[PDB]
Amino acid sequence: SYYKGQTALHIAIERRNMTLVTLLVENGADVQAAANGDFFKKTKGRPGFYFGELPLSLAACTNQLAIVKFLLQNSWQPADISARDSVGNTVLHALVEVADNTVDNTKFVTSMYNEILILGAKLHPTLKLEEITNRKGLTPLALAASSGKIGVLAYILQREIHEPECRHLSRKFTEWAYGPVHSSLYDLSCIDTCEKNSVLEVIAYSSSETPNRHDMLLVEPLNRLLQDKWDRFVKRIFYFNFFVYCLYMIIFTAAAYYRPVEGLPPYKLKNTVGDYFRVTGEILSVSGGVYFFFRGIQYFLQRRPSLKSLFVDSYSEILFFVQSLFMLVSVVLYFSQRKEYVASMVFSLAMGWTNMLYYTRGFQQMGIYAVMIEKMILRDLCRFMFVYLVFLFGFSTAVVTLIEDGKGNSYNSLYSTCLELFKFTIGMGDLEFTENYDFKAVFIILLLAYVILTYILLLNMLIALMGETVNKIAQESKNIWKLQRAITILDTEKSFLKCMRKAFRSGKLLQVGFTPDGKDDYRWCFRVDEVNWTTWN
Amino acid sequence: QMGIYAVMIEKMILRDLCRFMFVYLVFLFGFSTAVVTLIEDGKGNSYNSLYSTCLELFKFTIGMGDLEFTENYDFKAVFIILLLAYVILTYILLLNMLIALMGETVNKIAQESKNIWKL
Amino acid sequence: SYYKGQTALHIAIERRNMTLVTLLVENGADVQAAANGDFFKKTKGRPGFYFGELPLSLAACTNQLAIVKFLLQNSWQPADISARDS
Ligand SMILES: CC(=O)Nc1nc2c(Oc3cc(-c4ccc(C(F)(F)F)cc4)ncn3)cccc2s1
Ligand code: NA
């Protein structure tokens, strides 16, 4: 319980009391404090600390090297390192759990992590502590990746260690070096393709809430690994797909332009050469439609998107799906004897053409443009649209009330006046479009006020804000594009899951170090050469 | 003073204008083919040709276009919706995009333009 | 060749070994190492160093004032400065 669950040790250690623990364990102190206190539970709503059920966890989350050394090297009761807590976190899991993203916390967390690992190595050198799982199912790496901790991930993937006595547990196995040049082999064991949660699979298919989802792909091996995959086997496939889609749109446009016009919908087939080509075109178009619909359904049913990330983490997918939906509705109408299918087909064709921009992500300098237009169709344009709509509606209803038409005559309808003011907005309007009014002064004053407030004031305001936003978000757009490219590389490699997988495996099977057991360390390493002129050691 | 101007116009005829031209061309072609499909001309009459409609949309772009240039269509709602969507996406969104990017590029490359002129 | 053309001096100096060269040239050390090793060739694709065929070049490209002074002011075999490479 809260204070019936807190053993002497928890609150004991809490106040940095070495002497007290000395005594308490000299006589004997239990090291299995099942503190589930609402204060000390995982519950985030409760203001407290999830240092960990076990007391070693409490010593660790706090900057106490002495106690973390002592509790484990104390003559007896060296609390079992593989101590699954309520949620399952081992000591390292808790250490990752507490870590924040501030620099000082980076120092603290990484520094401790290393030392605890080496102590565990010495203690019982058969337990692979970094693979122990948690309730949800996640290794320490998986957690650092999902929750989002730049520092911890950086350390683990660049975890270079020394003191050969036991150095198997490292990442950056250095190789031949000759002057200012030096090779280097990374590990890439649980990064690319294996387990149930790879690092490069939880950094991309992750919600937008995770902090710096788009900044963790610059660590060290991830970046070059993705680019090596791209330059080798995910370049030709993407271009061929682009070609196929561009051909499909052309066939659809050809089928649409030559639509027969004579009679109500279901149209019989002639026996001319052209009429067969038309039917073929129609069949291909509907096939494309069904394909896209099923793709959308699968996407939505497997990677469940939330209501907020619906339009923040999936924009291309939604548009693909909606285009497919319009196509299918057109088809269902066309067979029901209704000539309203032209509208659905037209909308489908327009959106299909505008959807080519999904392929700009293969080229560096246009993906940025596409992402920028995305951001400012969700950031800057909506607000301006709303305010301008209020202005237009107000002035249009005013003028329509003023107009008389008791005699360019049917200008009473609100629609006509609204259209005239919009025409004012697009630089074609007329300042004397009607004369039926009864007071010229009021009409001119309203028109001039509208022109001042919308044409000259709001539009230049929008230009100013767009300039400011651009100068703010150039870099953010770049990063978003990088993440988008990573998404597509993963998707393309997966899509051939059934076709082939062997060739789709980066790295090379190297063997550099050895294990304390006395065996080899067969690891899939990947070279990254470097040159330095100041280290010189 | 003027060599810098010439070099700047070169840089932005090889950097900024090409991309905008491509994207705008995609938009124009898509909406023009959509509208041309919608049009009927089963009765300002020979508006079936793709060329005439493309020219009309470009006229929209240069601030002279007309929002009721033809009446042969069969559904007014669809025609107006397409025209308004085009106007929102090209006239008000992309052009001010290009203004913003041109300003940013100028602020970035004043010095580069000077150096290129010296060379 | 790569390691057959690599003379004792090249790898010798490489590790900042004064004493060693002292001895090696005290008895005598050739200063005409024709190291054309793919690693040590002008080839940029090969990750290595083009410090230069002769070993004085190796001493020079690396921050070794001592050896560049020595190899030329050593009692004998002051490697011909005008030593055209490959
Ligand atoms: C797979 C995919 O689309 N990727 C991307 N598309 C775009 C983009 O294109 C659009 C087009 C439309 C649209 C809406 C309605 C209509 C109609 F009038 F027909 F109803 C037509 C078009 N809305 C939003 N975006 C603009 C900017 C960035 C990107 S990224
Ligand atoms: Na104008």
Swiss-Prot record, chain A:
Keywords, A to Z? ANK repeat, ATP-binding, Calcium, Calcium channel, Calcium transport, Calmodulin-binding, Cell membrane, Cell projection, Glycoprotein, Ion channel, Ion transport, Lipid-binding, Membrane, Metal-binding, Nucleotide-binding, Phosphoprotein, Postsynaptic cell membrane, Repeat, Sodium, Synapse, Transmembrane, Transmembrane helix, Transport
Lineage: superkingdom: Eukaryota
Membrane-spanning parts: 237-257, 276-301, 315-335, 340-360, 376-403, 442-470
Residue numbers binding Na(+) 1 = 427
Q: Which residues bind resiniferatoxin?
A: 315-316, 354, 361
Residues modified to Phosphoserine: 306
Question: Membrane topology per the record?
Answer: Multi-pass membrane protein
Q: What is the effect of changing residue 423 to E?
A: Restored channel activity
Q: Which tissues show it?
A: Predominantly expressed in trigeminal and dorsal root sensory ganglia. Expressed also in hippocampus, cortex, cerebellum, olfactory bulb, mesencephalon and hindbrain. High expression in the cell bodies and dendrites of neurons in the hippocampus and in the cortex. In the brain detected also in astrocytes and pericytes (at protein level). Isoform 1 and isoform 3 are expressed in brain and peripheral blood mononuclear cells.
Q: What is the effect of changing residue 306 to A?
A: Largely reduces PMA enhancement of capsaicin-evoked currents, but no effect on direct activation by PMA. Loss of activation by capsaicin and loss of vanilloid binding
Protein location? Postsynaptic cell membrane; Cell projection, Dendritic spine membrane; Cell membrane
Q: Where does ATP bind?
A: 3-6, 14-15
- The PTM Phosphothreonine maps to 174, 488
Q: Which residues lie on this side of the membrane: Cytoplasmic?
A: 302-314, 361-375
Fill in the misc note. Responses evoked by capsaicin, but not by low pH and heat, can be antagonized by capsazepine.
Q: What is known of its domains?
A: The association domain (AD) is necessary for self-association.
Q: How does it assemble?
A: Homotetramer. Interacts with PIRT. May also form a heteromeric channel with TRPV3. Interacts with CALM, PRKCM and CSK. Interacts with PRKCG and NTRK1, probably by forming a trimeric complex. Interacts with the Scolopendra mutilans RhTx toxin. Interacts with the spider Tau-theraphotoxin-Hs1a. Interacts with TMEM100. Interacts with PACS2.
The similarity annotation says: Belongs to the transient receptor (TC 1.A.4) family. TrpV subfamily. TRPV1 sub-subfamily.
Protein's recorded name: Transient receptor potential cation channel subfamily V member 1
Which organism encodes this protein?
A: Rattus norvegicus (Rat)
At the highest ranks, the source species' classification is: Eukaryota, Metazoa, Chordata, Craniata, Vertebrata
